[PDB]
C-alpha cells in the first residue's frame, strides 16, 4: 500500500477539490515524506498522518482553510516554522508519540497565533521540570494542551 492508493480510495478518482479531509495512515513513504498530495489542493479541514515514518516537514500544499492536523508515531525532529508559511490557520496540533529532543524544537510555533491545542505525549521534551509552565509562557496563543489547561473538553 502507498500514499497514492489511499488518495485514490478517499477521492474515489474525483476532482481534488471534493474532500476537506484526508486519512494517510499506515502508508509507507519515500525517505519519510508525505508525497501523493499535490499542491493543487485548495480546500482541506482535517488531516491524519500516523505510522507514516515522516522525518521532516518540507512538502505540504499551501492552504488557508485547514484547522486540524494529526502527526503521531514518527521520528520527525526539525523546525516547524514552515507551517506558518504553508498554513498559518492551525487550531488543533497533535505530535503525540513524535521524537523531539529539547524545547527549541517547539519554539517556531510562536509566530502562529491561531493554534489553541497542542498534544505532546511520551516525548523526550515532556520529561522536564516546569515543561508545562515553560511551554505555556513560550506559546501565549495556546489555549489548550495535552488536556489539562484548566478543565477537560473534547475536540
Amino acid at each position: 500500500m502507498e500514499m497514492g492508493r489511499r488518495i485514490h480510495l478517499e477521492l474515489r478518482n474525483r476532482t481534488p477539490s471534493d474532500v476537506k479531509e484526508l486519512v494517510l495512515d499506515n502508508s509507507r513513504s519515500n525517505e519519510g515524506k508525505l508525497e501523493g498530495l499535490t499542491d493543487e489542493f485548495e480546500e482541506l479541514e482535517f488531516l491524519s498522518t500516523i505510522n507514516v515514518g515522516l522525518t521532516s516537514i518540507a512538502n505540504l500544499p499551501k492552504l488557508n482553510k485547514l484547522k486540524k492536523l494529526e502527526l503521531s508515531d514518527n521520528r520527525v525532529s526539525g523546525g516547524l516554522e514552515v507551517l506558518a508559511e504553508k498554513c498559518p490557520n492551525l487550531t488543533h496540533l497533535n505530535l503525540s508519540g513524535n521524537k523531539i529532543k529539547d524545547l527549541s524544537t517547539i519554539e517556531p510555533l510562536k509566530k502562529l497565533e491561531n493554534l489553541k491545542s497542542l498534544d505532546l505525549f511520551n516525548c523526550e521534551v515532556t520529561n522536564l521540570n516546569d515543561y508545562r509552565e515553560n511551554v505555556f509562557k513560550l506559546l501565549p496563543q495556546l489555549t489548550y494542551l495535552d488536556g489539562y489547561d484548566r478543565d477537560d473538553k473534547e475536540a
Binding site: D25, N26, I50, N51
Partner: protein, 760 residues
C-alpha cells in the same frame, strides 16, 4: 500411477476370484477383508532382529527411483541388490545404505518439523524451561487416581477425533459434515494451515493428530499436582521415599458458573429439561458451544453432570448427595417412608433406608469408607487431607446416614429454600442447616475413645488431629483408594433435571448443586434473551454486542432493505432495561436518524453500525419541530464508566481501524476487516462439503463428477454430481444459508409447548 492403478486393477480382475469378491463385498465389509492376513507373527522379535541385522540385505526397500542415487556397492561395500522380492515385491538393502543416506544424498525440507510434530517440541519446551528445586527424601503419601498422561490441545471423544482428523487431512470423502466440525472449526483451520506445505505420508500425520487430540488416561499413584504437565514428568517428580520440586515451563470455573446459572434458570420454570438443553447448546465460551469443555473433562461438578445428562454425554455414575460422591460397595437399602420426630420437636414423614449398606465416600480431597445401618451410622474411615474437606465429609456423611442422633441434634428451624425460591425435601434442608451450623450435631453426637492402634488415630470436633474422637469416626494413617469400575452405566434424565438409574432409583437430584456464585473468568456469551436478564449492565452490553456480531450477515442483509422490522428484535429488549427510561427514546430517535443517513448518503461502516443499532429498540421522541435530537455520549445505567462514545470509542466499546480490531467490555476480538470478504474469512474454517446439501441420486445428466474447487464455481441453487465418502455417487445442491439443527429442534419444541399451553 493412475494408469498403473487401472492396469493393476484389470490384471487383478482377470482372475475370477477377484471379480466375485469385489462384486460381492460392499464397501463397509472391506474391513473384514483386510483382517484376513496370515498372522504368522514372529515368535521372538529379539532373535529375529539379531539374525536380520547380520544378514547381507535385511532391509526391505520399496521399488522406486531412489535407489539410483546410491550404487549397488559403494567403496567396496554392498548396499542394495536388484534381485526380485515376493514378500513386498520391492528390492533388498542393508543398513549401510541407510547410514550413507544419513551421511550423503538428497537434502530435504526442514519446515515441516516446526509444526507437524508440535506436541513433541512442546514437550521439549516444557522440559527445558522447567525449574527444579530441592529433594524431600521423607516418605510421600500417594493416591491412585485417573490421570491424563499427556496434555491435549482440545480433548474430544474418539469418534469426533477421527471425524476431525478426516476433515483436516482428507479433503475428499467428507460427506455431510456432522454437528462436530462447526464446534472445532478453529482447530480445523489451524491444523489445516499448519500442516499445509508438507510431504509426509498422511497416515503419520493422522496418528500424530490422534495422539494430539484423543485423550489417554490411566490409574497412577500421584501426590500433589495432577495436570498432564506434571504427569509427563511423574517418573522423576514422584518417588516412594523421595519427592522433587518441579514447575513446568481458567475455562473450568467459567463452565461451572455457566452450568449453575443454567440449572437455576431452568429449574424455576416448568419442564426444566428442554429449556436447560436449549440454553446449554445455545451457549458459547469465546469460540465454541458448551459441548467443547464439558465433553473434555471427565465428570466434574454436579451441575455439569446434570447438564451433560441433559445433553448427550457420558457422566460417571457416582451418587452425588450435596457434595458427597458415594459409590455403593454392597448391601441393598429398602427406601420406606417413616414418620420421625426431629430434635426441634416437629415430626416429619421422610424416606429411610432399612438394611445395612456401605459406600466409598469422597468430598474434595477427602476419601473414606462409610458403613451404615438403618437409622444409624456404624463406621467411618478417613485419611487426613484437609480440615475443611474433612469437616464437610463428616457432616455430609452424618446427614446422609440419617442417624437418629443427627435428628435429635437439631436446634433451630428448617424452612429454607434455594436462590430460585423453592421448598426442598427435609434431607437437603437438614444438610443446609447442619452445614450452616456445623457445631450443632457435633456437640451432642457423643465421643468415643481414641482408636488405640499402630496407625489408627482419632480426630476431635474441631478437625484437629486430636484424640478423643467422635463416635465411629476414625482416621487411618494410610491411603484409601476407591471408586473403581467407573462403568458410566446407562442413566436416564427426568424433565426436572434429576437423574435416575436404569431402574427408578434417583442418583442425582436437581437440588444437589450448591448455591454459590462466582465470576466467569471468560466471556459467557449466550444466544437466548431469557438467560441474560440477571447480571450487571456491562454483561448485558457485552452479550448484546456478541449477539449482534455472531449473526452479522442477517442484520447486514436486512439493513439494505431499510425496514423497521430489523430494529424490533427481542435481543435488544433486555438492552432496553439498561437505558434510562427518561432518555432512551431520544437515543432511539438519534440512532435511527444516524443510521438512515448512513444508508442514504454514505457506504458500509460496520463499527458505527454495530455501535448505534441496539439503542433503537425503544420508540423515538423527535424534537417539537420534528428533527431528531443529537448526542455524542450515550449514558448507561450505573453512570461513570457505563457510557458509550458515538465518535471513536469508550471503555465498553472501542474499534481501532489501523489494525481493524474490536474491544468490547475489555475484550479484544478480531474484525479482520469488513465486507463479505471478511465474512468468508470467518468461514475459512468450517468443513469441506459444508455449503452443499444432498438431493437425488447419481443423475448422469451432468456427465463426470467435479472437484470441490470446481464445485465452488457453481452458483447457489445449482445441481452437481459428486462422490460421497468412498464412492457413492450422489447429486448435491449448493446451500444458500448456514444451518443449525439444534436451533431448529429448540424452536420446534418451543412451538409445541406453546400449542400445548394454549390448548390447556
Amino acid at each position: 500411477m493412475t494408469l498403473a492403478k487401472i492396469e493393476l486393477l484389470k490384471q487383478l480382475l482377470r482372475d475370477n476370484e477377484a471379480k466375485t469378491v469385489l462384486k460381492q463385498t460392499t464397501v463397509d465389509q472391506y474391513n473384514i477383508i483386510r483382517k484376513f492376513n496370515t498372522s504368522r507373527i514372529e515368535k521372538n522379535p529379539s532373535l529375529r532382529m539379531k539374525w536380520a541385522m547380520c544378514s547381507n540385505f535385511p532391509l526391505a526397500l520399496t521399488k522406486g527411483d531412489m535407489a539410483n542415487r546410491i550404487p549397488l556397492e559403494y567403496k567396496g561395500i554392498q548396499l542394495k541388490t536388484n534381485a526380485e522380492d515376493i514378500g513386498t515385491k520391492g528390492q533388498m538393502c542393508s543398513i549401510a545404505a541407510v547410514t550413507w543416506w544419513n551421511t550423503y544424498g538428497p537434502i530435504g525440507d526442514t519446515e515441516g518439523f516446526e509444526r507437524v510434530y508440535e506436541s513433541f517440541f512442546l514437550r521439549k519446551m516444557r522440559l527445558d524451561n522447567a525449574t527444579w528445586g530441592r529433594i524431600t527424601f521423607g516418605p510421600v503419601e500417594r493416591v491412585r487416581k485417573r490421570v491424563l498422561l499427556n496434555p491435549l490441545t482440545k480433548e474430544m471423544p474418539p469418534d469426533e477425533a477421527s471425524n476431525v482428523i478426516m476433515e483436516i487431512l482428507f479433503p475428499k470423502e467428507a460427506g455431510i459434515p456432522r454437528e462436530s466440525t462447526w464446534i472445532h472449526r478453529e482447530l480445523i483451520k489451524e491444523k489445516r494451515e499448519k500442516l499445509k506445505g508438507t510431504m509426509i505420508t498422511p497416515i503419520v500425520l493422522a496418528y500424530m493428530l490422534e495422539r494430539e487430540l484423543v485423550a489417554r488416561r490411566r490409574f497412577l499413584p500421584v501426590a500433589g499436582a495432577t495436570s498432564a504437565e506434571f504427569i509427563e514428568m511423574l517418573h522423576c517428580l514422584q518417588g516412594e521415599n523421595w519427592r522433587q520440586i518441579y514447575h513446568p515451563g481458567s475455562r473450568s470455573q467459567s463452565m461451572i458458573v455457566a452450568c449453575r446459572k443454567i440449572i437455576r434458570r431452568s429449574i424455576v420454570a416448568s419442564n426444566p429439561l428442554e429449556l436447560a438443553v436449549e440454553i446449554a447448546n445455545k451457549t458459547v465460551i469465546d469460540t465454541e458451544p458448551l459441548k467443547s469443555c464439558l465433553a473434555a473433562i471427565d465428570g466434574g461438578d454436579v451441575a455439569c453432570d446434570i447438564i451433560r445428562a441433559a445433553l448427550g454425554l457420558k457422566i460417571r455414575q457416582r451418587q452425588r448427595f450435596g457434595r458427597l460422591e458415594l459409590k455403593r460397595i454392597s448391601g441393598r437399602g429398602f427406601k420406606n417412608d417413616e414418620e420421625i420426630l426431629i430434635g426441634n420437636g416437629t415430626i416429619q414423614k421422610i424416606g429411610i433406608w432399612d438394611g445395612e449398606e456401605e459406600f466409598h465416600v469422597r468430598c474434595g480431597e477427602c476419601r473414606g469408607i462409610l458403613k451404615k445401618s438403618k437409622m444409624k451410622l456404624e463406621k467411618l474411615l478417613i485419611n487426613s487431607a484437609k480440615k475443611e474437606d474433612m469437616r464437610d465429609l463428616i457432616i455430609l456423611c452424618m446427614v446422609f446416614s440419617q442417624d437418629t442422633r443427627m435428628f435429635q441434634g437439631v436446634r433451630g428451624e428448617i424452612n429454607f429454600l434455594n436462590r430460585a425460591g423453592q421448598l426442598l425435601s427435609p434431607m437437603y434442608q437438614l444438610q443446609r442447616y447442619f452445614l450452616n451450623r456445623s457445631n450443632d450435631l457435633f456437640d451432642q453426637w457423643g465421643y468415643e475413645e481414641s482408636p488405640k492402634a499402630s496407625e489408627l488415630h482419632g480426630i476431635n470436633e474441631s478437625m484437629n488431629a486430636s484424640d478423643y474422637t467422635l463416635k465411629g469416626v476414625v482416621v487411618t494413617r494410610n491411603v484409601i483408594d476407591d471408586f473403581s469400575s467407573t462403568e458410566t452405566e446407562k442413566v436416564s434424565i427426568t424433565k426436572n433435571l434429576s437423574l435416575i438409574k436404569r431402574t427408578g432409583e434417583v442418583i442425582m437430584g436437581a437440588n444437589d448443586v450448591s448455591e454459590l456464585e462466582s465470576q466467569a473468568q471468560l466471556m459467557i456469551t449466550y444466544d437466548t434473551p431469557k438467560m441474560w436478564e440477571m447480571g450487571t449492565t456491562k454483561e448485558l452490553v457485552q452479550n448484546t454486542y456478541q449477539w449482534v456480531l455472531k449473526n452479522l450477515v442477517t442484520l447486514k442483509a436486512q439493513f439494505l432493505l431499510g425496514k423497521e422490522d430489523m430494529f424490533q428484535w427481542d435481543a435488544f429488549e433486555a438492552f432496553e432495561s439498561i437505558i434510562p427510561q427518561k432518555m432512551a427514546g431520544q437515543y432511539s430517535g438519534f440512532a435511527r436518524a444516524v443510521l438512515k443517513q448512513m444508508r442514504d448518503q454514505e457506504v458500509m461502516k460496520t463499527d458505527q453500525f454495530i455501535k448505534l443499532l441496539p439503542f433503537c429498540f425503544s420508540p423515538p421522541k423527535l424534537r417539537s419541530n420534528g428533527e431528531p435530537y443529537q448526542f455524542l455520549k450515550l449514558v448507561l445505567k450505573g453512570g461513570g464508566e457505563n457510557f458509550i462514545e458515538v465518535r471513536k470509542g469508550s471503555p465498553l466499546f472501542s474499534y481501532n481501524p489501523q489494525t481493524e480490531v474490536l474491544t468490547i467490555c475489555g475484550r479484544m476480538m478480531s474484525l479482520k476487516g469488513k465486507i463479505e470478504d471478511e465474512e468468508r474469512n470467518r468461514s475459512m474454517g468450517n468443513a469441506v462439503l459444508a455449503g452443499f446439501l444432498v438431493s437425488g441420486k447419481y443423475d448422469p445428466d451432468l456427465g463426470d463428477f467435479k472437484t470441490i474447487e470446481e464445485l465452488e464455481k457453481l452458483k447457489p441453487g445449482e445441481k452437481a454430481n459428486i462422490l460421497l465418502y468412498q464412492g457413492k455417487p450422489v447429486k448435491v445442491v449448493k446451500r444458500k444459508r448456514y444451518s443449525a439443527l439444534s436451533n431448529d429442534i429448540s424452536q420446534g419444541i418451543k412451538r409445541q409447548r406453546m400449542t400445548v399451553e394454549s390448548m390447556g
